Design a protein around this ligand. Structure first.
Ligand SMILES: CCCCOC(=O)c1ccccc1C(=O)OCCCC
Ligand SMILES: [Ca+2]
Ligand SMILES: [Ca+2]
Ligand SMILES: [Ca+2]
Ligand SMILES: [Cl-]
Length: 124
Protein backbone atom coordinates (compact mmCIF):
# COMPACT_ATOMS: atom_id res chain seq x y z
CA UNK A 1 0.00 0.00 0.00
CA UNK A 2 1.28 3.50 -0.56
CA UNK A 3 2.33 4.13 3.02
CA UNK A 4 4.34 0.93 3.03
CA UNK A 5 6.31 1.93 -0.05
CA UNK A 6 7.33 5.24 1.53
CA UNK A 7 8.37 3.29 4.55
CA UNK A 8 10.33 0.85 2.30
CA UNK A 9 12.21 3.79 0.79
CA UNK A 10 13.14 5.02 4.24
CA UNK A 11 14.30 1.49 4.92
CA UNK A 12 16.63 1.48 1.87
CA UNK A 13 17.75 5.13 2.20
CA UNK A 14 17.61 6.06 5.92
CA UNK A 15 18.45 9.72 5.15
CA UNK A 16 15.37 10.23 2.94
CA UNK A 17 12.11 12.06 3.26
CA UNK A 18 10.41 9.94 0.55
CA UNK A 19 7.47 12.24 -0.17
CA UNK A 20 9.77 15.26 -0.55
CA UNK A 21 12.66 13.41 -2.30
CA UNK A 22 10.95 11.19 -4.86
CA UNK A 23 7.48 12.70 -5.41
CA UNK A 24 7.43 14.89 -8.53
CA UNK A 25 10.94 13.96 -9.64
CA UNK A 26 11.64 13.76 -13.35
CA UNK A 27 8.98 12.53 -15.77
CA UNK A 28 7.87 9.37 -13.94
CA UNK A 29 8.17 9.83 -10.16
CA UNK A 30 4.72 11.13 -9.38
CA UNK A 31 1.13 10.62 -10.57
CA UNK A 32 1.35 9.08 -14.07
CA UNK A 33 4.27 10.01 -16.34
CA UNK A 34 4.97 10.84 -19.96
CA UNK A 35 7.82 10.80 -22.48
CA UNK A 36 11.16 9.24 -21.71
CA UNK A 37 12.69 9.18 -18.22
CA UNK A 38 15.45 11.83 -17.79
CA UNK A 39 17.89 9.77 -15.68
CA UNK A 40 18.13 6.38 -13.98
CA UNK A 41 16.24 7.45 -10.83
CA UNK A 42 13.26 8.57 -13.07
CA UNK A 43 13.61 5.19 -14.93
CA UNK A 44 13.23 3.32 -11.59
CA UNK A 45 9.99 5.30 -11.28
CA UNK A 46 8.90 4.51 -14.83
CA UNK A 47 9.67 0.81 -14.13
CA UNK A 48 7.55 1.08 -10.87
CA UNK A 49 4.67 2.64 -12.84
CA UNK A 50 4.83 -0.28 -15.36
CA UNK A 51 5.11 -2.82 -12.55
CA UNK A 52 1.81 -1.43 -11.28
CA UNK A 53 0.32 -1.51 -14.84
CA UNK A 54 1.21 -5.21 -15.03
CA UNK A 55 -0.28 -6.04 -11.60
CA UNK A 56 -3.57 -4.48 -12.74
CA UNK A 57 -3.42 -6.90 -15.71
CA UNK A 58 -3.36 -9.88 -13.37
CA UNK A 59 -6.86 -11.15 -14.00
CA UNK A 60 -6.23 -12.86 -10.65
CA UNK A 61 -6.10 -9.43 -8.86
CA UNK A 62 -8.80 -6.78 -8.39
CA UNK A 63 -7.61 -3.81 -6.30
CA UNK A 64 -9.85 -1.51 -4.32
CA UNK A 65 -10.61 1.51 -6.63
CA UNK A 66 -8.30 -0.25 -9.13
CA UNK A 67 -5.26 1.14 -7.43
CA UNK A 68 -2.59 -1.28 -6.28
CA UNK A 69 -1.49 1.45 -3.86
CA UNK A 70 -4.51 0.49 -1.79
CA UNK A 71 -3.31 -3.03 -1.24
CA UNK A 72 -1.39 -3.72 1.98
CA UNK A 73 1.07 -6.56 2.14
CA UNK A 74 3.50 -7.66 4.79
CA UNK A 75 7.15 -6.85 4.73
CA UNK A 76 10.04 -6.10 7.02
CA UNK A 77 13.14 -3.94 7.22
CA UNK A 78 16.43 -5.28 8.69
CA UNK A 79 19.62 -3.13 8.35
CA UNK A 80 18.68 -1.50 5.11
CA UNK A 81 17.48 -4.79 3.59
CA UNK A 82 13.75 -5.21 2.60
CA UNK A 83 12.04 -8.56 2.84
CA UNK A 84 8.65 -9.35 1.33
CA UNK A 85 6.80 -11.86 3.47
CA UNK A 86 6.30 -15.14 1.70
CA UNK A 87 2.80 -15.44 3.19
CA UNK A 88 1.57 -12.43 1.07
CA UNK A 89 -0.91 -13.68 -1.54
CA UNK A 90 0.04 -13.62 -5.23
CA UNK A 91 -1.36 -10.06 -5.76
CA UNK A 92 0.26 -8.71 -2.57
CA UNK A 93 3.54 -10.40 -3.38
CA UNK A 94 3.46 -8.74 -6.87
CA UNK A 95 2.89 -5.28 -5.40
CA UNK A 96 5.43 -5.95 -2.62
CA UNK A 97 8.06 -6.72 -5.30
CA UNK A 98 7.20 -3.64 -7.36
CA UNK A 99 7.83 -1.54 -4.24
CA UNK A 100 10.95 -3.35 -3.04
CA UNK A 101 12.60 -3.30 -6.48
CA UNK A 102 11.75 0.37 -6.73
CA UNK A 103 13.13 1.21 -3.23
CA UNK A 104 16.37 -0.71 -3.95
CA UNK A 105 16.58 0.99 -7.45
CA UNK A 106 16.05 4.46 -5.90
CA UNK A 107 18.82 3.55 -3.41
CA UNK A 108 21.50 2.94 -6.09
CA UNK A 109 20.54 5.73 -8.62
CA UNK A 110 22.26 9.10 -8.62
CA UNK A 111 19.98 11.80 -7.27
CA UNK A 112 19.97 14.81 -9.59
CA UNK A 113 18.55 17.90 -7.89
CA UNK A 114 17.75 19.62 -11.24
CA UNK A 115 15.16 16.92 -11.86
CA UNK A 116 13.07 17.59 -8.75
CA UNK A 117 9.87 19.36 -9.89
CA UNK A 118 11.01 19.13 -13.54
CA UNK A 119 8.91 21.20 -15.94
CA UNK A 120 7.27 18.06 -17.32
CA UNK A 121 5.08 19.79 -19.92
CA UNK A 122 8.36 20.92 -21.55
CA UNK A 123 10.81 18.12 -20.83
CA UNK A 124 8.81 14.95 -20.70
C1 LIG B 1 -5.79 4.80 -10.59
C2 LIG B 1 -6.00 6.22 -10.08
C3 LIG B 1 -4.67 6.88 -9.63
C4 LIG B 1 -4.70 7.33 -8.14
O1 LIG B 1 -3.62 8.19 -7.56
C5 LIG B 1 -2.77 7.61 -6.61
O2 LIG B 1 -2.97 6.44 -6.29
C6 LIG B 1 -1.61 8.40 -5.90
C7 LIG B 1 -1.95 9.02 -4.70
C8 LIG B 1 -0.98 9.72 -4.00
C9 LIG B 1 0.34 9.80 -4.46
C10 LIG B 1 0.71 9.19 -5.64
C11 LIG B 1 -0.25 8.47 -6.38
C12 LIG B 1 0.30 7.79 -7.73
O3 LIG B 1 1.47 8.03 -8.09
O4 LIG B 1 -0.48 6.91 -8.50
C13 LIG B 1 -0.01 6.57 -9.84
C14 LIG B 1 -1.18 6.24 -10.79
C15 LIG B 1 -1.23 7.17 -12.01
C16 LIG B 1 -2.46 6.90 -12.88
CA1 LIG C 1 6.72 8.17 -5.87
CA1 LIG D 1 4.52 7.63 -11.96
CA1 LIG E 1 -4.08 -7.03 1.73
CL1 LIG F 1 6.27 8.65 -2.75
Amino acid sequence: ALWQFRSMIKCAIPGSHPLMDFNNYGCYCGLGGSGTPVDELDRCCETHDNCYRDAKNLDSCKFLVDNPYTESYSYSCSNTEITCNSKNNACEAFICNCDRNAAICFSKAPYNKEHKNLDTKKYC
